[PDB]
Amino acid sequence: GTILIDLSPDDKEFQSVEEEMQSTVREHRDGGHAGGIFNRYNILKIQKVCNKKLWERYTHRRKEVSEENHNHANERMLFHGSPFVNAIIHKGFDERHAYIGGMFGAGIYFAENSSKSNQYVYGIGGGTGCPVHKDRSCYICHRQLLFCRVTLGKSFLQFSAMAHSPPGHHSVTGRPSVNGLALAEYVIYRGEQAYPEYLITYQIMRPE
Numbered sequence: 001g002t003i004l005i006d007l008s009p010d011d012k013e014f015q016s017v018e019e020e021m022q023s024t025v026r027e028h029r030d031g032g033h034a035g036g037i038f039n040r041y042n043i044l045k046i047q048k049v050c051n052k053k054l055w056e057r058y059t060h061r062r063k064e065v066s067e068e069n070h071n072h073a074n075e076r077m078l079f080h081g082s083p084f085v086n087a088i089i090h091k092g093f094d095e096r097h098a099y100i101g102g103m104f105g106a107g108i109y110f111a112e113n114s115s116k117s118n119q120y121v122y123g124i125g126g127g128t129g130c131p132v133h134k135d136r137s138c139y140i141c142h143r144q145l146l147f148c149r150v151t152l153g154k155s156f157l158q159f160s161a162m163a164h165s166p167p168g169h170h171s172v173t174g175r176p177s178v179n180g181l182a183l184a185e186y187v188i189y190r191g192e193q194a195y196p197e198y199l200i201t202y203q204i205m206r207p208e
């Protein structure tokens with residue numbers, strides 16, 4: 001049921017998605033071990049992910065959350081990196097896409113910083129890097145990330161350095177408490193609370 005529509009680089013929607021990607025790169029405490037060394041990306045393609053059934057699955061859940069939270073879904077646009085990006089865009093998020101060992105429990109994790117999600121494209125800790133060169137910092141191989149619509153509802157705030165949501169909450173927010181430049185990371189425990197809106201194909205760029 002999924003079709004992928006290419007956005008033109010001239011389209012305002014391409015441009016605003018690229019800007020969110022590029023502007024939320026930061027340096028990471030691993031010095032680039034997991035995701036590579038780079039300050040920016042070469043965006044090769046941005047596609048909109050269209051699946052009626054998956055969209056309706058998302059909106060149904062969004063309304064349930066909204067009605068439990070004074071008509072406020074608390075919807076965000078967040079990045080997701082994963083070895084399973086191809087299954088997600090065809091079958092939706094579910095328990096098989098969860099970070100079982102994540103610091104907020106087994107759930108599906110999203111980031112404000114695109115460079116955080118980039119660390120998971122080739123697996124946890126960057127796995128063994130690109131399939132072809134076994135390089136976590138490969139500047140040649142094409143990578144993919146998702147830019148997703150995520151319903152947070154009432155989010156449990158964790159001030160820090162599939163399971164269930166904390167009672168009375170719909171998600172967890174990991175607030176950065178040491179690295180003053182890091183943006184927030186979020187966890188949902190129901191695959192229905194996210195829709196994979198954009199598929200972004202890119203390379204990390206070697207700093208000059």
Ligand SMILES: CSc1ccc(-c2nc3ccccc3c(=O)[nH]2)cc1
Nearest residue numbers: 080081082097099109110111117120
């Ligand atoms: C099913 S195996 C797996 C494990 C971890 C992640 C992941 N973890 C994150 C943790 C924090 C922020 C973003 C992410 C993120 O974008 N992805 C994706 C898939």
Ligand SMILES: [Zn+2]
Nearest residue numbers: 130133138141
């Ligand atoms: Zn490579």
